[PDB]
Amino acid sequence: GSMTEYKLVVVGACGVGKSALTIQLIQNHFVDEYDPTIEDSYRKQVVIDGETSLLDILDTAGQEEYSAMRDQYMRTGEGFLLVFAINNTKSFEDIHHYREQIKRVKDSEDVPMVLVGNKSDLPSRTVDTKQAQDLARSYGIPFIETSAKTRQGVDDAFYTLVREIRKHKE
Ligand SMILES: *CCC(=O)N1CCN2Cc3cc(C#C)c(-c4c(O)cccc4Cl)c(F)c3OC[C@H]2C1
Ligand SMILES: Nc1nc2c(ncn2[C@@H]2O[C@H](COP(=O)(O)OP(=O)(O)O)[C@@H](O)[C@H]2O)c(=O)[nH]1
Ligand SMILES: [Mg+2]
Secondary structure, eight states: OOOEEEEEEEEOSTTSSHHHHHHHHHHSOOOSOOOTTOOOEEEEEEEETTEEEEEEEEEOOSSOTTOHHHHHHHHHOOEEEEEEETTOHHHHHTHHHHHHHHHHHHTOSOOOEEEEEEOTTOSOOOSOHHHHHHHHHHHTOOEEEOOTTTOTTHHHHHHHHHHHHHHHHO
């Protein structure tokens, strides 16, 4: 029957859990060693607020920043997940650079994004919840705490981005 296809892109520094968040959503698996240069897309059909949704998720990786292939996925991308790790201060600081780069390639100021603080299962936190929420408010986007290990917030992160895209359409 009726459904909506959503083109999603996951971006963030090395080792934050981009690949782990994608594989956890798609096949309920926590991957320990996913090759950091492997940049693949994964499809998943899910019901979100009683609407059938076809998620198409690009997991960015260690490849050239400005190849025709990445430009194509960035230009077609409808929503962005801005991922940092809550035990990695530099990955959180880097969120500023990624948001502006997304705005620049999308040539717009209203691009649907969600801020995702991943590895929420780790005690050795260095980015407190308040700091992340401050950053999220400064950009007018929601913030979701997630763990690819425990599955906490994984569904919520992707489903919230879908809701953000819905708002942007109307
Ligand atoms: C460990 C390797 C890995 O997972 N990577 C490599 C580093 N990369 C950083 C990154 C940088 C930029 C930039 C500039 C973008 C990007 C590009 O290339 C074009 C348009 C918009 C944006 Cl945000 C990017 F997507 C990434 O992805 C994260 C990360 C992945
Ligand atoms: N404890 C914990 N480890 C994680 C989590 N997400 C990813 N990792 C680990 O961090 C490492 C880097 O993950 P990966 O998904 O490859 O990061 P990427 O470079 O952003 O794609 C891997 O060993 C993962 O098992 C998480 O939520 N909790
Ligand atoms: Mg990866």
